[PDB]
Design a protein around this ligand. Structure first.
Ligand SMILES: CCCCCCCCCCCCCCCC(=O)O
Ligand SMILES: CCCCCCCCCCCCCCCC(=O)O
Ligand SMILES: CCCCCCCCCCCCCCCC(=O)O
Ligand SMILES: CCCCCCCCCCCCCCCC(=O)O
Lengths: 446, 446
């Protein structure tokens, strides 16, 4: 059924980079290039969506999810490499979605005069106490996670709704903080880039790319939904069409409404803003110096609480339940510890992904963590888009998930050169890893 | 016989970067790091020497040379990729060794007041008229090229000999040009780096690496020498031991003898030089601004004429005679034109390597051309050092060319990460090329 695969994907790709960093990305690269970031990051994942819909099309592989169907259709050589890369990418994405949860709690406790230890040392405290109570949800409560998640999405569509219903209001006491209407003087200004002290185009692309990346969570269940052949193809390619048309409609709206670099004080007019207020260049309540812009009705603070905890919970249950099936096929013999669990729940893999999330959570900057999430998600999407081409050349019958051609090769080049433009010495290292884990698997005795 | 395989290798690796750029390299990176450049560039080619000696060890493949023995021992999948990479690297190295021939002719015609067109536009003229009279040697005269080359090497060992016999002389009228004896004040100064406006360690490594790279020219004949199994292993690994102990003995001698940044005029003493002369920082006859240092007896100008023409002639006869056998196995069907010739001489491949040399010769800077020679020579040595490991894992019997272990893998990593530190977007492109030319060959019907 589509309504249990579209929700689990559309709720996973609406994450942390929608409210608290998309204004920063449309502030750095303007409007005309940020929409190009949306379109390039949605081409590079709609080719992967076509490919992972063509994977789930061929056979009646009902058991397992997102590892049982990409391994038994494409061979253990690619299936053992993707089963480590994607299971590590979900182990670090949970650290990303929790530092994004913590830095909007400490910046809400900065209001009303609350300081725990320091400015960014309390991010480590809240990120410590968040993951240990996400393990309490991941271990025990599974009936309350799959059920009652539409209530965890309708309070996110209300957060989109009051945001759009608030940016048409006047709010005359809010224009010192940069808020305005829809004037042409502010759209014509925000159309070009004003790149900051170090950020370039591919830098803000690396920051943005984890906002369009959880599309395999729809296909990450197949022993749970009925008729998995029909559902996966249209509930993955339709969540992308909703989410990209929400990202463009938010980036163009918040770009044509709030002016960059404007502080909040008493000022008057009587040639950049050309409006009733005037500011200085060499700000705190601006559009490029604070990360949380809000029209009105502050349940956007609740709209974070359902956009970052839900996508972190869906990437904490999903890394050891892939890594367990990887260690059950016994492809890598050094990892054979991580298959014994307590209802087939791996509790000794939860400790491993807890240590990985706790290691990558102690660095308390989201703009440092997001490129090394966008590294491994491209290093798994390139392996999917290339392994389907390699099965198309070393003849697996695709059975038409609306496009299963050899244009996926073009989606495996764009996941490769863009992964090297962003931090080339970390793409070299992961391609040496995924070539060594290919040669080790193809030349072993089994 | 060793005396016809050691000469053809030792004369090919003594090339352009010995007299006219090794002083610049020991001037940039000092003495203590330039010897590390020698040692790293000789480790990364002695692993390749062990590997290409283990290739020539297995069978009695008497016909052909350096393509017949690396293809029929390692398979057409690696043999068709190395047969293009190495045959293009020799097609651009002939442009390198002729711009190095031309810029020491125009800097000798700058003395005695001769200007043809401009300062570096006459390099293009002399490089144009040099390659067209190297094609006259390559096509017609082959008996005078193989015979009478010891006379083309003894006038190079005389150029080393009078250089060493000249740097012990006083030459009191030459010390304004920076020449001195062997003082401790000049050795202690030249021990550390004084990197220029853009050059780093791997930049001067990229400049130096074509000085230690023609070691496959010994194994590039096997239908010409008797008993090729015995000779190749010890005439390749012994030319490297001579040439590295000449490079170190030249770099430490010219580094401890001539001071950097000293102009030639009338000066006197009465704390950098601490000698009888004194100069200013903000030079023409110095050690880092002129490329040709000379002790005495100017037949070093003849010592260029046998070090750069001989190594360019040996890389003009060797690119189409590899590419012809590649186009005779008909692995790549689009290249099937380049096999018909006039005594089996390919004349329509000479036109192709003439156009490649003429294309890369019109850029008249040696420091631009040398990194894109050191790119493709590392991209062929990595494929040799990895294809021997891949035949060691996909079981070809090595028969002990004194080391044929799986340490060659370590020589295929060091040819890979150092090829990416130098100009990463040109190593990415050539690894996509050599992976596409692997997948095209392994999945074709034959
Ligand atoms: C940097 C350029 C791409 C790097 C490639 C990383 C590792 C990919 C592994 C795929 C190799 C498989 C090729 C076909 C092998 C076969 O035919 O058996
Ligand atoms: C042209 C390619 C050069 C780059 C080399 C990439 C890294 C190769 C690593 C391969 C490791 C193979 C390990 C095999 C272990 C075993 O067989 O037990
Ligand atoms: C950038 C990292 C290394 C890139 C390697 C480029 C391609 C050279 C090796 C080709 C793949 C060889 C794998 C052999 C596996 C098999 O066929 O069994
Ligand atoms: C790990 C993925 C990296 C992607 C790198 C892919 C490099 C390009 C491969 C091109 C293969 C072309 C095969 C041609 C097939 C044919 O024409 O028969």
């Amino acid at each position: 059924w589509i309504k249990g695969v579209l929700v689990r994907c559309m709720l996973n790709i609406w994450g942390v980079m929608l409210f608290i960093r998309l204004s920063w990305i449309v502030g750095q690269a303007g409007i005309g290039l940020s929409v190009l970031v949306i379109m390039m990051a949605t081409v590079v994942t709609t080719i992967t969506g076509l490919s992972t819909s063509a994977i789930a099309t061929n056979g009646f592989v009902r058991g397992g999810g997102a590892y049982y169907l990409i391994s038994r259709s494409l061979g253990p050589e690619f299936g053992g490499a993707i089963g480590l890369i994607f299971a590590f990418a979900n182990a670090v994405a949970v650290a990303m979605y929790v530092v994004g949860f913590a830095e909007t709690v400490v910046e809400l406790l900065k209001e009303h005069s609350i300081l725990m230890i320091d400015e960014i040392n309390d991010i480590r405290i809240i990120g410590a106490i968040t993951v240990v109570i996400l393990l309490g949800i991941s271990v025990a409560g599974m009936e309350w996670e799959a059920k009652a998640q539409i209530v965890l999405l309708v309070i996110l569509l209300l957060a989109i709704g009051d945001f759009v219903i608030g940016t048409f209001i006047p709010l005359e006491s809010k224009k010192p903080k940069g808020f305005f209407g829809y004037k042409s003087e502010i759209f014509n200004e925000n159309f070009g880039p004003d790149f900051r002290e170090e950020e370039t185009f591919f830098s803000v692309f690396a920051i943005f790319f984890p906002a369009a990346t959880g599309i395999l969570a729809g296909a990450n269940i197949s022993g749970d939904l009925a008729d998995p052949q029909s559902a996966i193809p249209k509930g993955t390619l339709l969540a992308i069409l909703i989410t990209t048309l929400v990202y463009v409609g938010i980036a163009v709206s918040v770009g044509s409404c709030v002016v960059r670099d404007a502080t909040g004080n008493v000022n008057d007019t009587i040639d950049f803003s050309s409006c009733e207020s005037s500011p200085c260049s060499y700000l705190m309540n601006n559009f490029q110096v604070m990360s949380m812009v809000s029209g009105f009705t502050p349940l956007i603070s609740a709209g974070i609480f359902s956009a970052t905890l839900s996508s972190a919970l869906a990437s904490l249950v999903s890394a050891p339940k892939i890594f367990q099936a990887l260690c059950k096929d016994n492809i890598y013999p050094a990892f054979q510890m991580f298959a014994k669990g307590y209802n087939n729940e791996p509790l000794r893999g939860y400790i491993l992904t807890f240590l990985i999330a706790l290691g990558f959570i102690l660095i308390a900057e989201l703009n440092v963590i997001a490129p090394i999430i966008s590294n491994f998600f491209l290093a798994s999407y390139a392996l999917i888009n290339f392994s389907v081409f390699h099965a198309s050349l070393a003849k697996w019958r695709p059975a038409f998930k609306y496009y299963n051609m050899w244009i996926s090769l073009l989606g495996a080049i764009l996941c490769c050169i863009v992964m090297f433009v962003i931090n080339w010495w970390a793409a070299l290292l992961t391609y040496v890893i995924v070539l060594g884990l290919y040669i080790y698997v193809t030349y072993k005795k089994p």
